[model samples]
Structures are given as structure tokens and as C-alpha cells.
Target: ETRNVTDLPGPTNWPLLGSLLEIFWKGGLKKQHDTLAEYHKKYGQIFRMKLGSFDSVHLGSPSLLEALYRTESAHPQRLEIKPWKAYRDHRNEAYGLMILEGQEWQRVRSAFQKKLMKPVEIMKLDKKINEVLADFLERMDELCDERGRIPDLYSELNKWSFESICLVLYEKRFGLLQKETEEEALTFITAIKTMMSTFGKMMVTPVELHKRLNTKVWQAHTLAWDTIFKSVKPCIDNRLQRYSQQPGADFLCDIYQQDHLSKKELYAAVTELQLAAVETTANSLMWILYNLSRNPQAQRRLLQEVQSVLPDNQTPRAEDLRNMPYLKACLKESMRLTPSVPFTTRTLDKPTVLGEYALPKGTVLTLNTQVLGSSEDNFEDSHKFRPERWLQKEKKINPFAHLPFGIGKRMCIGRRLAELQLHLALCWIIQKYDIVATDNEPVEMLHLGILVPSRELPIAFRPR
Candidate 1:
């Protein structure tokens, strides 16, 4: 039998407000991870917090993560975004895999699994991804001045990511890397940014009330998604028509042949995939580049690794990536410092004991990933950037402790594809240029669902 939530240790709980004041009123929601870390220090690894009617347990220990994983049900539930579901229901739109629950989620995930998760399937698109990366490098060369400093580097990375993911999905370039920006791509990116910004507010507010009142937040949320769907609809429809005419014409053609997902479902799934790909991949590439810029020695070591594996000035191939362990390690170490998706949530499917506390079924658990990853207890010299730590054979660490992408059945489906893009981009960049930070100011993390640098990182690239 599981113990009641009151049995668990936590902060001062008022009758209605609970920990909301401690989290929001004290310092606002901007420093969420920092706030959580402070609470973790105070309450120990496991603690309960309630905001309004929502209750959640925070787990900072890797052992607890292991326990949670083992106890997870066949159709494990994650923290649902009520705003997303409400919006979909209002518009009569199909819920994508990201928001789908239970049997529907499993069915869609399984159908997409063979296509997205398999190494062989992802490897097939490597050359295509590289083609986009090559264009991105060319664009960088043009955009950067003689000193090789590209202004608004974050925006550039966004376009590159969009182009790369779309190439893998539709086998068609959106011309995002070209000299002139595509209006549709720009609109889509803007809509994505607005959607992410608005999502946080809707998550905390009473969505049903806001929808009834038609608040600005509610209106914007609806419009943002509408703009996104409108932007990608043509591309998706074009692909559908082609698949019907010539079977196996594109990457998604395999899924079309399966005849499992309806056209609407297919559109929603791919649209969500594109949305997921853009922000996470772009922000991750930015942080990885930032880390390399900050650590000159690490950058040089990475360059050496790239040089040994690849011929001078030649593009990196899918097979060639195997020889460059340090390149992969560099990306891993970078993610450890600043994971793109800083934290993940999982709802308990049944009673599970985490540490000394027994959590009842339906309890939401938030994994303190950023804190555990950067904590000195988990890694030696955690503050320092050390790619070699990942390469050490003698060193043993809990695999669950540093989950950048996450763990178990619900882990990121695009893991291999994301890795392939990072490896190829890093190889190309390190081989060609000496990356250096232009300013001493530290890059601050901005929490907009995914963690991103607060501002554009000013850096210069010199010819290696």
C-alpha cells in the first residue's frame, strides 16, 4: 500500500496556494530551475509541491529515476499540457503523439518507431542532412565578416535546423539557407516562438476560464497554432499527393504505405515532429558551439580528432563519423552542462516507492535533470568543460544521472537523427575554423519549455 502525500516531506503548504507562492511570488517563474535547485538543497532529493490543484513530486536522485522507470506501466503517462489538449479540442484537430495518451499514443508511437527510431532508417537520410549542413556552412561563410563573426547567430541556426529536419521529412529543401529568407519559413519560426512563449502562461492559468472569456493569451495561442498549420499544410499535402502517385517517393512514403495513420493524423504527427526538431536542435547546436568557443583547448582537441578522421576540406560522411569519438564526446559533454530539454516529467502509473517515500498512482514526478547533471557529486570538476571525462574507461557513472535526451520507452525518438546532425555539423565547423568567444559575459539560460541562451552568443571564427 502507498502512503498518503501528506506523509512526504515538503515546503510549507498553505490550504489552497501550497507551494505556488514559494515558486512564483518569491522570485517569479523565470528562475524555475534555480528555484527548484534551492528547494532540493533544503528538502533533500525528494519533496512534494502543489500548485493550485496540480500536485507533483520532485526527484533529484538517479536511483529514484531507476525505481520510477521499473514501476512504469505499459502505457506510461507523462504530465499532460492541458492548454494543448484544450486548444486541439476547441479546433477539432487531432492530437499528435506528443499530447496523445494511453492506447492512441502507443499506436501512433509504434507506427512511427520503425521509421524514426531505427538506426538504418535514420542513416538513410544522413547524406541528405549533410547536404543541408553544407549549405549552412556556405551561408555562414557569406554571412560572417572577415573576422568570421556572424551577427544574430541564433536566428541563423534556427533556419539551418528547419532546413535540415524538413529535408529528412519531405526530401525537399525549404531554401532556408539561401541569401533571401523564405517568408513562409520566417512566419512559421515566428509562430513557433510565440506559441512557446504563450504556452507557459496558459499552463499556469485557468485555460477553460480563459477560453470562455477569450483572453488575449487564449486568442494568441489559437492563432499561433493556426499559423503553424497553415504554413506546413501545403508541403504536407504536396508530399501526400506525390506518395499517392509514386509509391515510396519520400521518407514518409513508408508510413503512407502502412495505411495506419489517417491523413489528418499524419499531418499532425509530422507537424509536431517539425516543431520539436527546430527549437531543440537549433538551441543545442548553439550551446555546443558556445561551449567550444569558451574552451579553446577542447576546441583544438576536437579539431585534431576531426582532422585524423576526415580529409582536409572534405565533407563528413555518415560512415566517417564512427572514427571520431572525441567529436561525439564533445557534444555529450556540452549537453551535460546545458541540456536542451532541461527537465522531463512522468506520471506514476501505479504505487511506486522512490527513496524513502511511497508515491500513490497518478502522482506527477519532475526529474531535476539540470541540477543532477551539473552537480559535483555526479561528476568530478563539474564546473569545468571536460570532453575527456566521457572518454575515460576507468570512470563509472550512473547512466540515468546524465540523461540529456531522457530515458526508457518515452525517450526521444529522434535521438539518432539529432546525433547525426550534431556530429556532422561539429566535424565541419571544427575542421574549418578556430571558434573564439567575443565577450567574457556568461551566457544565461532562458526557460521557454526548452532551455536556450538568453541572448545571441557573440563569437568569431578564424580559419584553422
Candidate 2:
């Protein structure tokens, strides 16, 4: 009734090196997802391959996904990001939830999970996010040319997400949206961008070799992370000092009160949260806007839903977002098509049965969400943008198949806060602008660390 894991179909793996040659040949590391998708087509939903040094089982089916998640522990271990770990190790920095392992991960996760995951807890930051959103609107007005088009919309949206997350975590305003931002803040943002791009390169190649060579890529990685550490220091320190002197209910203070982690650990956790949130959220919003721009019917439907919820066109509350079902659908559907995070992995702590094959401990299970979403097997008219499928009660959709935020205990901690910002921002944006697509060509995704538009999207926001 079962088969060996090694017998499953996958790409050719040569002796010693595994599929490294194919990984490099098939568009290198940047197109990893695309290559994976190609492999998914050749091998079907469940397959195994020796990617680098070890065999990895890639799962795309909901049944297999359910099996993978069902066997998960309280301390679910995702794939180890070698580059990030190497950086921290070299700098003598503690690993945060993002890079931590075993018992330590569960400890740090439990501490942060107190607030970040709940909708009600994050919604309380609605007023603050709206303040950032309002500033963003002003910035948009300033940046858009006479034709109402904004150039390099990717980084512009990045500023909006940066300011919003900072508001939630730091309670400090850096005027990122305004014409003139602070010098240090600019460096921080630029550093984050550099770090983001460089991270992909580091992941594809050997970190040790690069570090030993003191190569440009590794040096850039070092410089970028160093800048991030320097920038986050004074910002969090000033707040940590205040929180110690005076008890408060702010995000940073609440976590500090628990005393579960050291100051350095706190810095690591908070910095990772802020850094992870920025570009992904910005790119998700960018893709959604692009989706809405190209799909007029869905945009119109979403606009109606938003207008009905906020009859007077007022800034929305949590209740308003709940009422706008179509708006939620648009976001969901867009993510289904173009997810910011393409894949998530789990390294099995014990022997697990994903489907028919019994995988041993330390087996790497790759959940290819991008392929899962676009596959015809999972969705009807999978290539087309249809928000309504998510609303249909008659058809039972497999929840595990569409995981933009991931699932179970190891899901995105910043999800609720991120969605809150996205929902509110999208609602305001829809009510205000006719998001026009200046280019008719389909925007290709870069698929580095996160899936991003390969080039700057040509878009205009015309006042409605």
C-alpha cells in the first residue's frame, strides 16, 4: 500500500552534489520557484529530490499538506536559513524566532504570540495605522506626476509598509512618507532593500566560501545587516529605557514585561519582525493593486463592497473590514495568484508519513504554494482571477492548499497586523482611486526571497 520515499519522481540528482547542477542550470537560484513548479509538473504533486546534500520531499496536494501539518509538533521546525544563521554566528548575535531552533524557538514564539496573532489585539493599532495610511495618501499626491502616475511604485509602497510597521512596533514616526525623510531612516530603508536582494544570492551559493573570499556579495550582506543592526539599536534602546522607567501597554513594553528573553534577543526578534514585514507586505499590496487594476470587474465589486461598509467614505474600523466580504475575497484571490511568499518548508523532527511514503527524521518537506494555487487540479479556472470562488458555500475548498500566511503553529506571527494594514489601506485606496494599469503586458515575478514584480509596475491612481 506504500512506496519508498526515494522511488518518488523528481529531477535527476548526480552523485555527491545532488541536483545542484540542475538547480543552477534551470535559471539558477532566482528562479527556484519556477524550477520547482516545472518539477511539480513532471513529478506530480508528491515527489522527492536530493537538492543539495539531502533529499527533500516537495508537496503540493492538500491531502499531503494535511498529513505534513498533522504530524507537526508544538516546536515545528522550518528550513534553516543558512545565510542568516551564518551572519548571526559571525557577529555573535542570538537567533530570533526567524532563525532559532528547537526549544528556544518555541520559547520565543510563545512570548511574541501573546499579541501579534490576534485580530482583536492588532485591530487596536488601527488608529495608528490609519495615521500612517493618511500620510501615505498625501505622499502619493506629492509623488504622482500630472498624469497621476507614480514611478517605481514598488519602493514607494515599501515606504508605506515601513512607516506602518514602525508605528506598531516602535511608536516612532520617521516621516518616511514625506518629501524629506531623515538621513538615518533612508539608510535603514536602503539597507533593508539591499539586504533583501543580497539574501537571495547568499542562499543560492555557499556562505562559507563567500565569507572566506570576502567576496562582494558576502561583504554587501555584511554591510547591509550591520546597517540594520546599527539603525535598530538607538530606536529600540530609547523605547526600552522608557518602558523600564514607566510601565505601558505598548507592543515592545508588553513583551519586555514577560522577561522571557534577553535584551539582545528582544532586539533580534523585533528587528526580524520589522525587516520581514516591510517588503513582503509592500509587494503583496503592489500585486493586489496590480490585480485590481487589470481586473476591472473584481475592482468594481470590491469598491461597491467598501462603499457599502463606509457609506460616508470614512476611515474604516475592524467591524467595517469584516462587513466587506468582497474586499477580503479580492485580497485572498490575488494572493492565491501571486503570493508574496511562494513556499514554506518543514524539517521533520520525527519520522512522518506525508502521503504513502514514510519520511525519516530531518526530512525536508517543501510546500510549494505557488504551484498549488495556480494548478488546475486545485482550482477551477486557476489562471483567471476570481474572488467569488472563495465566497461560494456550496463548494468545499481545501484550506491547506492556499496558504499565503502558512498554517498551524508556525504560521506568520505578523499576519494579523499585516492584514490589518493591508485591509485598511486597500479599502482607503479603492475608495479614493481608479487604479489604472498604464501597461497591458503581464508583469513577471522575480521570485527571489519573495515573489515580486520583475520590473516596476506601470500604474496610475486617478482621483475618483
Candidate 3:
């Protein structure tokens, strides 16, 4: 039953065009999970799903996923990531950990893992997180109380998160939120959007035709890379010039202090760190806050938990978070409901038999993660906002189902740092204020470059 090459049913296709017409007819990603889930339910756990001329092997079952993740069966390099490549090409940014593969990706990842994400080392960033949280809350309070309506909290959160990461990674602060007049954060957002849209367009259009257009996407791409390099170049130059002379603590300084990396490699590595931290972390926070507003009961539970644990009207100490199981569950459940990076694309580099299909070399695979959690088998009452699910039966959920930050060797490198930041921020705000949704307006989710709360998540912040 688990053998390879079984006929699977899918969308009816015309000559030359496979499932391309159906996918694009409704916009490729619209109703994406329902379409995939329907096929998975009808055809069994593992089936062949075609997009355009490409046939992808779909694995919704936990057994198949475990096999692939545990073994080297699914080569990560073979996973087609055209969107990442598109961004790298358009930005002229070097691929360090998140993009590159083989020895190059390995080498960069090894260095990154050492410098960042080591449990002991990341725990020290708590002070930096508190400093940033204080600033963020102050801004939120002003906007909500004085303005009388929710401003675009999404943009502000993005700016603050970007600045916080930049401060930690580069030992340089952009003050994009404080400055309130700068375009650096705005430019980065524009650039990422342009590149993502361009990749989506290229997926459907004729290569020859796509190459000929003097496109707006390309222009935005150019502007984005130019700003990134301009912002980062000086920091790299200063670190390289002063490493031998100046003694200090910063990310670049630590790298320069190391003998293994060259100047070019360090520059590229920092670029990757900056981009990865800003977009993913900000997106995650946006989703969490959006969910918190929607699920008032969960929010109340978190507030009570934070207050009981901390006992002081101050931010909860990082050590206290260990005991705050409910807070952790709320955050976990929010991510499960809406992951920042919902799907991952990988292209095969070698021919492989997946389940019952012979997936050829060079096939592009898009893992539909949104549908993964939506399945009844994976979750209890899949549609409900139940933080307790994360804590049920001694706080364990199915391993394969809880993949918001991804899985295996390529799981999110910044997970530890991001979690700390999010926890501290959540504890600080919930302790100080009781957030009430304005006029009880329902929150709306939006799909940006990353999945996020579309507009600013606004709430009345009354002193608790």
C-alpha cells in the first residue's frame, strides 16, 4: 500500500497545459488549502498534485513526513525555492543560510548556528528585548489613547521589530520607528513585495516574455538592494577597519574577532541575518497580536498568568517565562493558526519515488502548510481558537502538525531569539493594560510577503 506509482486524480487538463489553467484561473494561492486538502482527502495521504507542467508529491500523513524528515530521503537542496532565488538575484544579496545549499550553505549555517541560536548565548539578549518593548508599548499607548483610533499598527510593529533586530545583529540602531520620517523600513517592505510578485509572475509567464518587460517589480527590487547594501556596507567597513583597534561587543565585532570568516563572507552573513530577522519576526508578532484580539478568553488567561507569575507591575523576568505555561501555549497556538511563512517551495535535483508517484528530477514542490493544520487528523476541532490544545495531555501536540517555525535541520535559525522577544513583549503589555477591541470589530488576516494581520491590530489599552 505504501509502494510507489499509483494513479491519482486531479484537475482535468487540456493539451500542453496541465493543471495550470485551474491554478491560475482562481489566482494560484487563493483557496489554496481547501483545494489541496480536498485532493488529499479524496486520493489518500500521499498523492500527485500538478501545478502547471510540474508534478509534486504531496505528503499529508505523519508517517510519510517522519520518514522524509528523519532520513535524508527528501534532499533539501532539491526543494525548489525559486522565490528565494528571485529575491537574491533581484537584490544582489549573497545567500548565507536561509537560501544557499551544499557546502556553502552548510559552512554558513554552521557559523550562524554557533554565533546565534545557541540556547545559552541567546538568553543574554533579554535586556535588549526589554529596552525595545518599552519603546514599542509607549508608541502603542500614544496611538491608541491620543489618536482615538487604531493607526496602522502593522507598519509600526514592522519598523520596531526591524530596528530591534538591527540593533542586536549590527550593534547599530536605525530608529525607523522613532525617526518616524525615514523610508528605510518602507523601502525594504516595497522591495520584498516586488521580488515576491515577480517570482509569482515568472512562475506563470513565458520566460522569454518575462525577461523583456521593463517592469515596476524590477525597479522596486533595485531600490531595495541599493538601500540594504548602502545601510549595511558602512557597518561592515567600520567593523573591518576597527576590529584590530577597537574592543567592543556587537555581532559584526564578534565575527571580526573570529579568524574563520573573510570580510566578504561576514558582510553577506550579516545581510542574511538582518533580512531574516526583520521580516519573519515582525510577521509573527503581527499574527500573534491579531489572534490575541480575536480570542479574548485566551488574552485574559495570558494576562492573569503574567500578573500571577510576575506579581510586580513591571515586565516579567526572562526566568519567569519558564513557569508561564499558558503564555507559551497562547503563542504556540497563535502560530499554529497562522504561520508567518505559511508555505515552503523546493525543487528536486534528483529523481525520486515519493509514496506512489515517480517524481522526476527538477520538479518544483510547494508544501501547503496552511492545509497541514486544517486537517481533522492533525488537530482536534481544527477551526477553533483553542490554546489548551497545545497544553492538552501534558502540553504535547503532534510533532508534524506543529511546524510553524518549520522542522528538521532547516528549522528557523532565529527561533530562540524571536521567541524571547515575543514572550517579553507579550508579558509586558498584558500585565500593564487590558486590550479591548474597538467597537468589537472583527480582525482580518492578510497575506503579505509573509502572513500577517493586514492592518494595524488596534485595541483600547486601559490600565489593568
Candidate 4:
């Protein structure tokens, strides 16, 4: 006898709205991840939850997780960021990678992949990233209070990521690290914050209704993206000017040579890459620091490892980065503990059997990574910060268990670029100074589109 999909245990689907009532009673939209975790325990590894649009199957399993991901279509489809797409349509602009679907997305992704993700090509970005990292050190020194504390560590890290990403993408510095930062750069930062926070808000609400009605949330969301799209003009125009003079001289020049994108697409795609780079990489860097800061032993162990590799105030090159395995381990461990995006999704391209249940084609699968990443079943001493686990020779872990950057065809496009920046940043910061979180209390997270520290992550960088 075959088990039907509905036979799988899960939350009740209430009238019209489904699990929305139960979810709200537990923690509502903000703490949806928390709610999901409790449900995973209640319903076991696999369950179905109905929450309006997200009437989907949920899984906290790494074993079946691999099977589901490996069977994905060449053109994997995930959630449609309706609010984001609606804004582009409303403004009569082009869709970027995040919004594109099927063939359109494939072509754009192909063009992006050629330039952005290669390990060798990304390694070349080390010079540009370090140029920003240099200023990051100076800014850290300049901004610290008398007790060696940087009060707004999160904002400062955002600036560092912004500066680093701009340098990598445009090969132009925005002086975001400078003492007197420009208004436009600050506005871009604020807008990005609003965009992500609004994106999360829009996710739980009926975005189409908000879009049709032009509600406050939708308006704010539109304005944020509007500011972002406009901000890209000067960056792209400057590149266009250079490309006309000398073709194939730089990154953009090579991109211009391909001519895969229209002028409007050029703007949208570049802006998407920039937006993709900022918050995710920056948040990942922050978590690494936060975890290391709290765990003094791990921090010093990493410092020893990094210092041994560099042996001076030198910025980390690709070679030096390769030698510092523990640094990489530390980064992985932090991400394992606090995944930047709590989950990765897949919508079945064909009807399939997931474990005992036969899923229909187009069935949405939400992997409860918030639980998957932390559950003791997946990781030993799951709550503890132990980079050594990743490096251990005694036992190998299931690679599918911890996918911080996701996996398969729809894996994070900016992953390699993010990795390079983090490698250099970790090397430089650890080599130069000793950082400790301001307090011992565990840093709590708020789930925006990506997880950000719920409050200020007060970290003090004491001079070595």
C-alpha cells in the first residue's frame, strides 16, 4: 500500500488561512523559524504545514535532504519574491537573477557564472578586497571608544562589506571606509536595510494585495529598491565609459564584450549582484566574529593559525588563505551554528517519492535548516562552537548536513566571491587585533530576509 502525501503528520490546516492561526499564536511571522523548529520536533523529520501560499512539505533531514536536492531540475525554481518583482514591473524595468525564471534566468546566470564564481578568477579579486580591508582596519582603529569597543560593529561590518564588494565588482572605491562617508553611500546602506527588512515583512503578508492597494509596506519596499536601482547608474555608467575607450581591459569590459544584457538589464543585474553581496557576506562575517569572540579559546587558536601563516602585518593572499585551514573551519562552524539564511527550498519539477510519501509535481519542500543545522542528530555538541568537528579526521560528516550557501543548480551565486572576501577579512582582522563580544550573553538573531543580530553586536577590538 502506498502512503499518500496527506498521510504524513503535520500541523492542522485551518479554514482558508491554514496554519496561520497556530503560527501567529506561537510567534507570528518574525519568529516563524522558531515555530517551525518546535513543529519539526512535534511532527518528526518530515511534515506538511499549510500557511496560505506556503502550503508545503517540511523536512529537517540531511539524509533525505541530499536525495531531494540531487533530483532537482536544471532550472530549479524556488520562491518568487513577488514584492521585488512587482516593483520592477511597476517601474517598467528589467528583472534580475532573483526574479528571472526558466530560460531567462539560465542565460543571465550563465553570463554571471562565467565571470563571478570561478575560483581562479575570484582569487584575483583578493587584491581589490584587501584594498578595502586595509581601510577597514583604519576605520576600526578610528571608531573604537576608549575601552577598545566598537559600539556599532554591525554597521561598521556592513560598510566594510559594501566597500569590499564595490571594489570587487566595479574596481572603484566608494570611500565607505573613510571618516567622512558620502550621503549616497549611507543612503544606499539604509535603503538596503529597509529593502531586506521590508522583504521579510512582505513575505508573510499578501504582497499582491499590498501591491494592488499601494500599502505602506509595499511603498517602503518599492522606495528601497528604487533607491538601489538608481544607485547603480553611476557605477555602471562609469564602466560603460571605460569599456568604450578600451574593450576587455577589465571585468566589466569582458562583460561588455559578451553583450548578454540590455542596458536596463545591465543595471538590474549589476545591482542584484551588489545587493546579493552586501548583507549575506557581512552577516556571515559578523557571526564568525561573534562566535569566536565568545569562545576565547577558539579565537586564540585561530589567531595562532593565521599569525603562523602570515607572520607579519601582511594581507592574506590566496596562498596564505589556503594554509589557514582552521580559519576556514572557524567560518564553517559559525555558519553551521547560525546559518545566514535559515533554509533552502525546492519545488518539485516532477512527481516524486520523498521517503514514504509520494509528492506531486510542483509540491514545495521547505528544509527547516534552522533545526537541521542545530539539532544534535546532525551535529555533536550542536550548541557549542567547535571548529575542530569540521576538521576532525576521526569521523566524516555528511556534507549535505550543513549547506550554508545552499546547493545544486540554484546554489548561492555569490558563494565563491563571498568566500574570498571572508577569507581575507578573517585573516586580516585576526592578525591585526583581538576582538571580543561586549557581553557574554548569546547574541540573539532576528530573521530579516537574512538573519541579522536582533540588537547591536557590541564587539571590542583590542590592539595586538
- Any runs in candidate 3 off by more than 4 Å, and if so which? 1-6, 14-17, 23-28, 73-75, 78-93, 145-149, 179-220, 239-251, 254-259, 349-361, 394-396, 439-446, 453-460
How well is each residue in 1-464 modelled by candidate 4, as lDDT tens digits? 45868799988789888999987787567677888888888988899988875678987878777878767788888877787887888888888887788988888888888778888788888888888888889878888889788867777888888888887776688788876655647787788879887876776677888887888998899999888888877788788787777765666666666654777887888888888788788899998888888899999899889878777776689767778889999988999888789886878889877778889888888876667777676588888999999888888788888888777877789988898889889888888889876776665676767788778776788888
Would you list the C-alpha lDDT of every candidate in the order shown? Answer: 0.81, 0.84, 0.67, 0.82
> Which digits, one per residue and each the tens of the lDDT, describe model 2 over residues 117-236?
877777799999989998899888888899889988887898888889987778899788776565648888788878878877876688988999999999999999989888887888
Decide which is better by TM-score, 3 or 4.
Answer: 4
Q: Which stretches of candidate 1 lie over 4 Å from their true place?
A: 1-4, 14-27, 245-250, 375-377
* Prediction RMSDs, each to the true structure: 2.4, 2.4, 3.7, 2.4
Backbone N/Cα/C clashes per model: 0, 0, 7, 0
Local error of candidate 4 at 395, Å?
A: 1.5
Which 10-residue window in model 2 sums to the lowest lDDT?
245-254
- Worst 10-residue stretch by lDDT in candidate 4? 251-260
Deviation of model 4 at 52, angstroms: 4.4
Better of 3 and 4 by lDDT: 4
Candidate 1 structure quality by residue, lDDT tens digits, 64-87: 788877877777777888888898
Off by more than 4 A, model 4 = 14-18, 197-223, 244-248, 375-378
Question: Which rank order by lDDT, best down to worst?
Answer: 2, 4, 1, 3
